[PDB]
Amino acid sequence: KVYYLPVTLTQFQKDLSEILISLHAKSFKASIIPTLSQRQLTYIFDSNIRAIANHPSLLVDHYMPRQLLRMEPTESSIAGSHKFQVLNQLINSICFRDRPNEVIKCAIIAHSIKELDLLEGLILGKKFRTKRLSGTSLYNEKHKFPNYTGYSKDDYDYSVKRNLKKRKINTDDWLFLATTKHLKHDQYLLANYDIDMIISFDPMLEVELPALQVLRNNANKDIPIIKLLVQNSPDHYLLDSEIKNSQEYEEIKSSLLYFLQARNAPVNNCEIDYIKLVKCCLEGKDCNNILPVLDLITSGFWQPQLTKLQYSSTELPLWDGPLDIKTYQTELMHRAVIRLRDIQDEYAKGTVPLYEKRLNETQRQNQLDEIKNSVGLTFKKKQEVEKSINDSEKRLKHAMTESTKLQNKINHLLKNRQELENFNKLPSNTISSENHLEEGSALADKLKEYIDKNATLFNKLKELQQANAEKSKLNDELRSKYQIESSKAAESAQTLKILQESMKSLENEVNGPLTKFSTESQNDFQSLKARNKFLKNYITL
Amino acid sequence: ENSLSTTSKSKRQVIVPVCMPKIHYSPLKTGLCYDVRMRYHAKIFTSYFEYIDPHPEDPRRIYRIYKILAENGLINDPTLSGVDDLGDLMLKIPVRAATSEEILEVHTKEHLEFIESTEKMSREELLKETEKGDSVYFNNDSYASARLPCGGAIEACKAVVEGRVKNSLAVVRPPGHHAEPQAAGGFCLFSNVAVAAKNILKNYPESVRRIMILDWDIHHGNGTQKSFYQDDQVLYVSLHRFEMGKYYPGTIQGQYDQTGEGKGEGFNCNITWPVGGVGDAEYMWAFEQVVMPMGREFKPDLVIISSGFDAADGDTIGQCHVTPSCYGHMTHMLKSLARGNLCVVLEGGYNLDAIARSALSVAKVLIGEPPDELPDPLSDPKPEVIEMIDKVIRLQSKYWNCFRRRHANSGCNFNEPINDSIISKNFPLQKAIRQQQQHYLSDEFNFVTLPLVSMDLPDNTVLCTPNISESNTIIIVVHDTSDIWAKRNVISGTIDLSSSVIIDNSLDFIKWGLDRKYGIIDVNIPLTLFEPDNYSGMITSQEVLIYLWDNYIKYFPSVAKIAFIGIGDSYSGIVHLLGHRDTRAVTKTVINFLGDKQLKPLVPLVDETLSEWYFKNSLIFSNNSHQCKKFGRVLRCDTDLNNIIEERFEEATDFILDSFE
Amino acid sequence: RQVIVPVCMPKIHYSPLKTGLCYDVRMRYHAKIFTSYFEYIDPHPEDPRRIYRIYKILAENGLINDPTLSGVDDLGDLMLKIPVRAATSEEILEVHTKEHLEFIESTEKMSREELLKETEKGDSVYFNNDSYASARLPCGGAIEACKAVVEGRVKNSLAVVRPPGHHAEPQAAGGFCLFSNVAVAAKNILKNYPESVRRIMILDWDIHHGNGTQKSFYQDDQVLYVSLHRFEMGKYYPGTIQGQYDQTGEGKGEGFNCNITWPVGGVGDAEYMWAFEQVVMPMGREFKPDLVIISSGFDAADGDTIGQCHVTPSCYGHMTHMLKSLARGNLCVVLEGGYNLDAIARSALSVAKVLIGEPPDELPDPLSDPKPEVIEMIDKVIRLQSKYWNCFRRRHANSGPINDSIISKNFPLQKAIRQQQQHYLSDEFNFVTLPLVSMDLPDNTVLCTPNISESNTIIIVVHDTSDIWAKRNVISGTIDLSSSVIIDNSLDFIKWGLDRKYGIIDVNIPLTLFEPDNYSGMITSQEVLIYLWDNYIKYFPSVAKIAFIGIGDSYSGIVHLLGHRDTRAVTKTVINFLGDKQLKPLVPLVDETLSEWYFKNSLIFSNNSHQCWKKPRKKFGRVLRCDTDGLNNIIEERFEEATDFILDSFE
């Protein structure tokens, strides 16, 4: 059983490969259509393309100082490549699987010592029992693979069995590391430790090997192999020539020509599930979640093009000339340096629109909130004036009853005057009646004042109701406008976040192991050493 | 002036060359998470203009907190919008949206689909999804504002672990300690603390393996407990009100005996205040006695505080009296706990002034200040709090080691359940004494049992003379289990059986009454039994006496002159009888040996002359060191419990005989 | 654009400042005179070098910028120099008498032989010609450091200063001290600033006792003195009655003195943490001080040959952290003692780091479970201090003579337990009563398996009455008997022996009431066992491989059956879980090869806190020392080894 996982590049590796194409395109075009020759040129071309595909920190012609490896987090480590992200996802899926008691063992195969050191730095602290079958290990722990005098002159010594209830035993899956070179130079390295699955970080393992035939023979079940596949690369072409069913120079040239043609390949796949995949792999069945892509179909590509940034406007000189090794190093160095300056300046200029967007957002939120407060206050005041309009209605009713009673007395005494006037015999009744009519007129003026005040109160109530009915519409309009702007605000925030990530990536690359010159190039602890149970949470025995 | 005065004129020699100070705490700053996009999530005012009193979970909260900092010089951001160059005391930490992996580490896919779908519903759909869930509101703009808190918490905690800050304050909303891994609830959408903790444990297995989560918010952390129940890498300690169904959430999962499950047993702890109204004293007591030894024993690598200031003074939802200096003291202790690592995530708080002041004090302590002084260090915590804390220490001693041999619990092993089978070596002591008493009484004067059918009580509770339905006179001794006088060893708790002195004070009456040829009925209600954990001696005694009066005694043909004698608090059971039934027809008197216990307030429910008749026909002896009309003729006995019994025996029996004539 | 909150400067007082450090190189000339060669191999009671060591350990860690290790002014960025000056006579006369001053002034000008006479007469002191000015310097240094703390020039201060001062009394000096430092500083503050400083709290954690400072503030209510030390009344210096735990003030200053005495040496971190968390902190919070002074001393650190304790430099950090929490932050650390330079260097470094702002490190072992003496001592202390304070009432159930004529009216309860026991045994295993006739004893004294006359193997379990665990209700005082448990201790052996088809015989033997030692119990045990052997065991036809198990006491009966008879033809193993009682000796009469046989096949398990090992002879038969205490714990621990020894003794 052999398997394949599609893996693609990241923006950083894309830009670095464009830089390399810029440095290598002209002589390659001349070829197809102690300085150096085209042979060593194409060799360095392919080797550096592969190195960039495998965690671009390997682009430098050096070794990691063997100290910073155990001093950087997994996030900053796997932020460079995508292969490391996929492999870390795979390892995490295999370590947190649903387990009775299984001590399943796995093997991991690299191509050289650089990649192996990077791996062992990535998988140092995890919950595994590891053994590096290649020399010069990194923090070797001693996990060994399987294959009371109380008195004088007496002898009891029950101590031994005592410890057989005290020693805690590990239950961590085994995981071995190896390189294909040392795997082919010797043999029998895998027939000793019965393993179940091999993860080949190299995609060209040449599946029929002696040291693997002995393993396929001695084992009981069928063993699955998992090769990480770069989606388009100078090795995927050959790997596809194998997937179906002198001359190395011509194969190299054809692969690199295909890589140049398919650099701008539009479509790559996604959506890889890991738990079902590791289940299928461990049980020994044909897995179907893996994608069957297998190839991509075939003047205009000799021109390198980087990723277009907002207001960047840069260019590439294409190096249409001869070269030499030290000139190669220096040229690549200053090209990376000028691109670094440009991306730095690019980051430091998108800061301004973010400021204004934040300010407008803050002001709009405060305006909304003040509007809500005003709405509440106005409704409260109207609710208060309600009971007053009710009592005013009561007073108006009282005044109207008084009016009716007074007009009835007016009519009665006026009829009495009508009696007493014809053939007069004048009493004081007309005087008293006139006095009563004057009282009626006075209280009529009073009631008129009161009904006027009632009408005024009514109009005030209605006007306040109108104001409260308008305020809510105002709030709703402001809410709608806010949401409309919020969409684009979130978009710009996310974009600048991603740009910060890419800038930090390039900075940390050129900061550490760096291209051959120092032209541009501890508290606070950014290198993960806030020491609370770090060294003692290494096993230290 | 002096003569010591080193007089040597030469150039000295370097001995210890200058170096950078080997200090790992406070050359650094403190992290602060804040972003203006977290004010987006808000309710939808639907019913009517309830704008007067808004919803308690309000955006301005964040703002207010931030603003307070800007008024105390801790931040130099004038426009009150999130900028980078805060100052010399803090350092801004960027907030990014959490991805699908981190948010699916603890939650399930159906929850993610539900939320991401409600992102773009209509209006009435949002209204229905709001009114359906248990105290959760959804709005059109709720997806991004809910993804942001988890990302902020993860970023703050990562900054702490990697060593770019000292501690961190994550001023963050919506809250995140009520969301269960499959459903939302309690104003929460995504559980922030669980997501953060699981991502730290997964992405950093070389500096962090054990994490301690402390929840001092006054409600229970439902989701954050359910997420780490079967796990032994996260120790979850919580302090809250419980009240069994009234307070939110009101579920069995918040009880004080949910002490783990699976291989995660002994890695969960609840501390429940019985009654609301606690203050500084209770918190300081529970922190000095429980939280700190357990913390020092667990040896964590990271301490997260799911803080919430709805228990502060002047609040309305919490109803407590915690002051801004108590938060400082707790923060100080927790700083002492680990090697300094600390993340403070904000969950609660619904009164702007209280949360503002409390957050200011907490931030001051985080920056480097020492805490202030308490308003009153003479407070004397409530009794129920002390009893609950003792009950908690018992269980946690059965799991942890720092709570036995220091609290006198090394005597027995509480892993074996106290039972009557041969499965456990432990047995209850009450049954032995009751069996001995039954043996003696039966073989001497033929004392039969009386069955309390259809109840959950031991068979030999009520003992009685034979043919009790034909006894023309009945004495009823509702006594209580005796009191021992021995030297309890203080390291183990075991008593020395050679020097014990126990007297059966409730037997002399039984002997006296037999000579007068009167039927006797003895009851024995124990005191909480240590077995059911919800036993109430008052309620149970009340039940037994109401049962005995309604079922059996109320139909006896030749009944006359029933007396009552009470010893200990069980006498209350007698009181609640007379105050709830007309019993004056056959009852003559009532005697009580209250000892040092407080008086029994008799309240009636049928008539009011009951108080007069009870005052006329009662004798209630009491302690001479007591000093304390409806209580019924309290008497201050000379001698003193057993002393007043042995001395005033003659007067009591003489009064009883006179009342009987 | 709207500037809502204008910029300002921060509003704090703690840590924009620096930590005051007091040190001077003129404090290293007060030294002894050579008398005998024995001074070369002894810890040199108080030596100068201490001081410079502390200074050096700071310079090597960057907390000080001093390359040449001499008193400079530009002390860096984390600390601040506080200059010293010799104190005036008034500051000294504020505490001492006027004849002590004349004594030291005479000491200044003596000859050599007179100096030797003075060193020989006095209560363990030594003088020297330069002992006047070097005695005046510590008082002034302490005064200036505490002054700086109070007036807010620094946050908190540390004063590397010698000679010490917590031993000198007002009347005369004694204990290698000349003048009291802490008392003088406290009195001059309390008389100088009667507006900010009105209460002071002095704490002493040196392993000796501070009689001087205590006597200074014995009749005062403005200075609370707390001290932790070792008492050991007869021998351990100073060995007086003042250091006892019952001295709680006198006069108007009653209840303002606290002593905490260790009954035995060898205490470590757990004891100090327990004492601080249980006694010092609530008392300190209730007293509500305005300045906390520490009379530090590092003669109790791990690696000392005089204190003989095991306190690690992390416990010092934890205590300093708590004490920093106590007051508003004001804290002055004066230094008094020490005997082993490396330990005091490490400890001083830890205290300095915690004073600068760090949190304390973690203790090396959080599972220590302090010695049983310390817990009883702390309870006794809490009793008196509950009489005087308030934070010890109503929380430890204190709230501020049985009879001798009622002993005839007593509930038996012994029988009761056994009675209960018998029942369940019967109802699940069908045991039978075995009669020991011609003896007046309760019938249920021995129960055997039915058809014991046909089994080969026999297990004989002899034990006393099972234990009791009683819960003490916390609200008020007394024991609660209605919620107690019975720890049956001889049930697992019976079950293990019945699941392998062995004959079982069980023997119960009571405890004599009102007796220190169960003497009559031992006599009853010997009689019952001897009778049971003589009338029953010799007559069962099929018999081989008998094994005894004695729990607690009543093993004396087993030893007596072994001695006064010859039974090694059939029996093969004796096992005894002592617990805490005294060992039972073997007395052989039949032969002495019997004694050697007994030493060979025997197992005795005892506590860790037993009287022994403070090596038992061979007439007790291979005793062993557990790592825990109590019967229940050692049984649950070594049940496996016991049953394995038993099973190995057979075929």
Ligand SMILES: [Zn+2]
């Ligand atoms: Zn809450």
Ligand SMILES: [Zn+2]
């Ligand atoms: Zn000392």
